[PDB]
């Protein structure tokens, strides 16, 4: 019966095969008695025939004509406890956008249909080694919680696979994996000051009315600690359980682990930016000279040092198809260095003609404007890409 804003809901009672067995009677009520050896019922509630929420309370019972704790009458899905731990980050591909991880995965659930008797074996635990959950389920003809990695590419190296069952009915799964996962959400537009997210998704392969993720267990540190330094450092992590649509229909469970990572900033600052500053400052200081036959040759020579310095850091520049923050700065620096050569030629021509006071005034203007353009450009880059 509805609580408020009654829409006169329609209810049905059919067999497991969809054949109708009873129909509602107008607080919709219905009764049915079955006499077959095996008798299974499915309760249908239809609301297809704009409304505000549901506000419903459904009451059912067996041999309870009164109605209006006891024992459960509806089937209940199994509850599965899941945990995941990450041990290493093997590598990251910045062109195909995928990364490789090494870790450990553990599952556990309770199912009385898997129980046995110790008398027929003289043992306490059963063993299924080097076999996946899907393979074992077919062997024993019992449903099992099959899973998969959502974004897996290629095969994965599985080690120490094993399932053990107890006479009560409690089973568990353990496996060590090395997998490569596709991550099309990478964004390298703020290189090398970019922060990424690594997502590891584990999806159940059965509908949510059979098996559902219930709890998260922490059997080990989620992110392990290893000796030495690493290219990518982890700042925070989280774990969550959600529901996603299934190809069959209804939904299935999903377990997600997200790691937030960032690069090594001391590497790029010292190796690239500090040497770049000294090369740029050399072209600024040559304007103090009052002769131009030597200023011109120093300015021309310093352009060659700038190009040669680009070869060393060629490995540190990714070969993507688009411009990043680092690429844009190097283009601006080259243009300003090349313009210095052009100004030097003009000054020498002025001095040879006979006008040297005009050439001296250009030196004063350049010595002030040149440091200003670099400061203005840096602020412009910060506003565009970082502070929205």
Question: Is 186 annotated as ligand-binding?
Answer: yes
Nearer to Ca ion, 196 or 344 (CB): 196
Residue 154 interacting with a second copy (CB under 8 A)? no
Asked whether position 315 contacts a second copy by CB under 8 A, the answer is yes
Q: By CB under 8 A, tell whether 309 contacts a second copy.
A: yes
Show the binding pattern over residues 127-146: x = contacts a second copy (CB under 8 A), - = does not: --x-----------------
175 is in an annotated binding site: no
Are 88 and 63 spatial neighbours (Cβ–Cβ below 8 Å)? no
CB 39 within 8 A of CB 53: no
Total number of residues shown for the chain: 388
Q: Which range in 113-121, 138-146, 234-242, 334-342 contacts a second copy by CB under 8 A?
A: 334-342
CA 213 – CA 216 distance, rounded (Å): 8
Site for a second copy in 335-354 (CB under 8 A): 335, 338-339, 341-342, 345-346, 348-349, 352
**Two tokens, residue 58:** 């459904």
Give yes or no for a contact between 260 and 235, defined as CB atoms under 8 angstroms apart.
yes
Question: Minimal distance in Å, beta carbon 279 to a second copy?
Answer: 7
d(CA 134, CA 152): 17
Of the pair 85, 282, the CB lying nearest a second copy is at 282
Q: Specify the residue for token string 């997200």.
A: 258
| 310 near a second copy (CB under 8 A) | yes
Give, as one character, the DSSP assignment of residue 270.
Answer: I
Residue partners of 62: CB distance under 8 A and separation at least 6: 73
Give the footprint of Ca ion on this chain (CB under 5 A): 226, 228
Tokens of 220: 């080990």
Query: Is 227 labeled as ligand-binding?
Result: yes
What's 118's DSSP letter? G
Site string for a second copy, 184-223 (x = CB under 8 A): ---------------------x------------------
Residue 278 corresponds to which tokens in the numbers above? 């000294």
User: Is residue 278 within the footprint of a second copy (CB under 8 A)?
Assistant: yes
Smallest separation, CB 361 to a second copy (Å): 18
Q: Is the CB of residue 263 less than 8 Å from the CB of residue 192?
A: yes
Provide the 3-class DSSP secondary structure of residue 305.
helix
Using rule CB under 8 A, residue 360 touches a second copy = no
Give the C-alpha distances (Å, rounded to integers) separating 169 from 116, 164, 224, 347, 377: 8, 10, 33, 92, 68
Task: Indicate the residue among 159 and 226 with the shorter CB distance to Ca ion.
Answer: 226
Lookup: tokens for 267: 């590497």
**Is 53 assigned a ligand-binding role in the annotation?**
no
User: Is residue 91 involved in binding a second copy (CB under 8 A)?
Assistant: no
Applying CB under 8 A, does 123 fall inside the site for a second copy?
Answer: no
Q: How far is the CB of 304 from a second copy (least distance, A)?
A: 6
Minimum Å gap between C-beta 229 and a second copy is 4
Q: Are strands 211-216 and 195-204 parallel, antiparallel or unpaired?
A: unpaired
C-alpha distances in Å from residue 367, one per residue of 200, 306, 332, 364: 54, 20, 18, 5
Number of other residues whose CB lies within 10 A of the CB of residue 193: 14
Q: Shortest Cβ distance from residue 122 to a second copy (Å)? A: 15
Best CA proximity match to 204, nearest among 140, 255, 151, 166: 255
Nearer to a second copy, 221 or 312 (CB): 312
Q: Which one of residues 297, 367, 380, 386 is an interface residue with a second copy (CB under 8 A)?
A: 297
Residue 331 makes contact with a second copy by CB under 8 A = yes
Q: How far apart are CA 3 and CA 54, in angstroms?
A: 8
Which parts of this chain interact with a second copy (CB under 8 A)?
125, 129, 160, 162, 164, 174, 205, 229-232, 247-248, 263-264, 266-267, 270-271, 274-275, 278-279, 281-282, 285-286, 288-291, 293-294, 296-298, 300-305, 307-312, 314-315, 319-323, 327-328, 331, 334-335, 338-339, 341-342, 345-346, 348-349, 352
Q: Which residues are documented as binding site for Ca(2+)?
A: 97, 184, 186, 227, 229-230
């Amino acid at each position: 019966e509805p609580i408020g804003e009654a829409p006169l809901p329609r209810l049905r009672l059919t067999d497991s095969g969809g054949k109708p067995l009873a129909f509602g009677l107008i607080s919709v009520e219905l009764n049915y008695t079955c006499d077959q050896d095996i008798c299974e019922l499915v309760v249908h509630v239809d609301g297809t025939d704009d409304s505000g929420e549901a506000v419903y309370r459904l009451l059912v019972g067996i041999n309870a004509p009164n109605l209006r704790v006891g024992s459960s009458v509806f089937l209940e899905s199994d509850l599965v406890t899941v945990g995941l731990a990450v041990d290493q980050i093997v590598g990251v591909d910045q062109r195909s956008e995928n990364f490789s991880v090494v870790g450990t995965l553990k599952l556990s659930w309770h199912d009385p249909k898997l129980g046995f008797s110790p008398d027929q074996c003289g043992c306490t635990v059963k063993s299924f080694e080097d076999a996946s959950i899907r393979a074992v389920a077919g062997e024993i003809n019992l449903p099992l919680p099959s899973f998969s990695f959502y974004n897996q590419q290629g095969n994965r190296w599985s080690q120490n696979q094993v399932i053990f069952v107890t006479p009560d009915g409690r089973a568990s799964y353990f496996e060590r994996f090395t997998v490569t996962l596709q991550a099309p959400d990478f964004d390298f537009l703020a290189y090398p000051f970019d922060r990424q997210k690594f997502s590891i998704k584990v999806d159940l392969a059965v509908p949510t009315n059979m098996f559902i993720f219930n709890e998260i267990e922490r059997f080990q540190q989620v992110v392990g600690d290893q000796l030495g330094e690493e290219e990518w450092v982890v700042t925070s992590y989280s774990q969550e359980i959600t529901e996603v649509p299934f190809e069959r229909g209804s939904t299935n469970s999903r377990f997600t682990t997200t790691l937030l990572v960032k690069r090594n900033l001391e590497y790029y600052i010292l190796r690239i930016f500090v040497p770049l500053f000294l090369i740029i400052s050399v072209s600024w200081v040559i304007f103090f000279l009052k002769d131009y036959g030597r200023q011109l040759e120093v300015a021309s020579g310093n352009l060659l040092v700038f190009v040669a310095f680009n070869f060393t850091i060629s490995g540190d520049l990714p070969r993507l198809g688009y411009l990043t923050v680092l690429d844009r700065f190097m283009i601006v620096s080259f243009c300003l260095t090349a313009i210095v050569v052009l100004i030097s030629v003009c000054q020498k021509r002025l001095g040879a003609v006979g006008k040297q006071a005009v050439a001296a005034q250009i030196d004063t203007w350049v010595l002030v404007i040149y440091p200003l353009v670099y400061s203005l450009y840096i602020i412009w880059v910060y506003l565009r890409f970082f502070t929205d």
